[PDB]
Paper text:
The phospholipases are classified into four groups according to the cleavage site; phospholipase A1 (PLA1) cleaves sn-1 acyl chain, phospholipase A2 (PLA2) cleaves sn-2 acyl chain, phospholipase C (PLC) cleaves before the phosphate, and phospholipase D (PLD) cleaves after the phosphate. Here, we report the first molecular structures of plant PLA1s: AtDSEL and CaPLA1 derived from Arabidopsis thaliana and Capsicum annuum, respectively. AtDSEL and CaPLA1 are divided into the following two domains: the α/β hydrolase domain containing the lid domain, GXSXG motif, and catalytic triad and the C-terminal domain containing the dimerization domain. In addition to the conserved α/β hydrolase scaffold, GXSXG motif, and catalytic triad, plant PLA1s have an extended C-terminal domain composed of approximately 70 residues.
Residue numbers in the entry:
A (entry chain B): 17 to 119, 122 to 158, 162 to 419
B (entry chain A): 14 to 119, 122 to 158, 161 to 419
The structure:
Amino acid sequence: REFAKRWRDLSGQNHWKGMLQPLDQDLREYIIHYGEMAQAGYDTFNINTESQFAGASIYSRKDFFAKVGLEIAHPYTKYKVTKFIYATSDIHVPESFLLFPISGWSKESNWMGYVAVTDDQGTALLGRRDIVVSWRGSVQWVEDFEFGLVNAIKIFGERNDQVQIHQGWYSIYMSQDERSPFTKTNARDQVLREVGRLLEKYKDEEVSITICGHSLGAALATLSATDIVANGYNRPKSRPDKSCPVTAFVFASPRVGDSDFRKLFSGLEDIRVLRTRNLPDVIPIYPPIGYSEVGDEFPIDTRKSPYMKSPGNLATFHCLEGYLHGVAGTQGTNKADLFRLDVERAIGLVNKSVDGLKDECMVPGKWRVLKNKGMAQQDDGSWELVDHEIDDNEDLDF
Amino acid sequence: IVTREFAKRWRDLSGQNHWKGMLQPLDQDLREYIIHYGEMAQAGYDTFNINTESQFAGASIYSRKDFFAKVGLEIAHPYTKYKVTKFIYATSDIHVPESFLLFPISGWSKESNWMGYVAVTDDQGTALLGRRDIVVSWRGSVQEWVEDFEFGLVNAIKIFGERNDQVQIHQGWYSIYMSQDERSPFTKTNARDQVLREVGRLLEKYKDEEVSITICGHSLGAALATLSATDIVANGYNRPKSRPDKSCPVTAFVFASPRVGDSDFRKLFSGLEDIRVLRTRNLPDVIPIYPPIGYSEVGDEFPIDTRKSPYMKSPGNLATFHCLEGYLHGVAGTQGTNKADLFRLDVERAIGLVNKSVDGLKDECMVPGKWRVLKNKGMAQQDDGSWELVDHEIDDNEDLDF
């Protein structure tokens, strides 16, 4: 019952005052909960460029959280995924952001995240009907976050015509491919439309929007949240007087825009952003000049974990499961604060996509992989690469 | 299947007449027969844990129960109706390459490996294959240096008796076959005697039926298969204990075989009437030349040339010319090794199998390279939310009741 009673404070109503140093124990679990919904994006994203479905989702929407390990011992992850989101980019971006079959299912678009909503049981457990937008992040160079600023008037309107945004985040959020069934509408508007459907469906209940993302996903989650609140997409179409809170839990966030972006953000009453930042991770410094941060910061230091390989590197300091292990055991970032896991979070999760744990933990490095990389024996004895569950992504009946 | 082609021809398919008339060109039944036993050797690779970060590196992933279904040999394998009755473990008194004995970095054993299995047809398989077929499958080499195969000769009197005291065997094959570890529950008895005992149990169980022994192996497994077949026949272990006058045929289907012993080993082999060995040899694979000096080959040879496959990436390398699934692809489509013979698949064998442990197919085939792996490398969410490395099915390997 504790999360339901306190959810507005846990979602940042008072900017997490009193809840960060030391870390509030409910908030410790709350942050990990939304970080898991961002990691689920990595766990479904096909990164095998030898596959024709590289850059698509492995799993379909149906029973999605059960398929990525978020049902067992996750009594609060009672969400239904209602829509997958796809993105493209008019400019060239790193393969860590858009990755393609070495040939394919698409030449220019990737699966870029999903929209989900609590079912009736999850709504009871969380205190409110929670709409989650989870933006997929970076896959395995700090020069990848290399971008000049661009004017964002097409997002924030003539009334905010001085706002500028990183050209890469802008391009992934806003670009379309008229020839594509996936990105003929851009990632932005796919999200806005589906969030609008859910807000209208649940217009008579208490509702929240929580947006999740790591690395690239953190930038998109920050941009998405600011867009939604600034343009009033956190109101049901038929109830323009009912605003719902929009909170982003973001991890290892690069910066998103300039000082005018920060100014716009600072005037929005209904938005809150908690940026969890690992002190040895350098990606939150980029880009290193010209940009402003927005939101509240929560620092951790995974070098204090006795489970993590020392010294770490760019990958291990950045990786999202490393972050969530840091949240799980952080007792502060001062030299005297001693790391201690205060939730039952399996350390082995750290090694999904890195060699991050000490060898004595006995967990193989970079272990996440489909059985046989997806190759599967068929009923006629043939062997086919079955690394993609079919899902037309049609609107669900509601 | 309805005509029982294999049951009717099994003695010839198992080499009764040294495969005369069946190799050039390749007899169609024999094409499928060779692949059948090569799959039983490949099953040893498919269960062998090669992840040295695991405590169970060097052990079997799967248990004996429903073994062939677990390694993909049930669907569309109507003839693979075998029960695995015993796992076989080996050690070495001398240091050997990691491709032969592989150990955890840290572990379940410091000196032994899973080294193969013994299986037997069930009553349905016995009907389909024409006899009660006892299979010994020796596990082979894991992933490369041809010097890994270069050992000197040792006297093999402990195997073949003072009556054959001139026979010499490769020191490496001898050591893996014969070594024991007194402190190990796995190799306190050597791999040789584990196999002899279990084959003996099965011959005695089925003493009143028609029986065959077929021994399978690739690379290291091919050498052990050849050595164990010669041991078994030379020492009379192909007779049930209570019927010393009932010999059964011993046939070894081996793939990419290094040489095993010297000229006296070949002379011993030539005098055994009940043994047959068919060595399938890929011409661009250099391993069957090793060791190059001092050794003889035994048995009948069946050459193939996977360079003729339009499915295989060109040029190949040591690994792709040697790999067992490449060999079985070559068998599936060989029409001869002459320049003018054109490769053509004459069985429905999925080309994707080639890429289990190599990048062997042309990129146009759209099959990922080196694809064989457990889901999540065996990491598994448990019912209490913990995540544990579950890459080993428990099997105490106790004798089955028969």
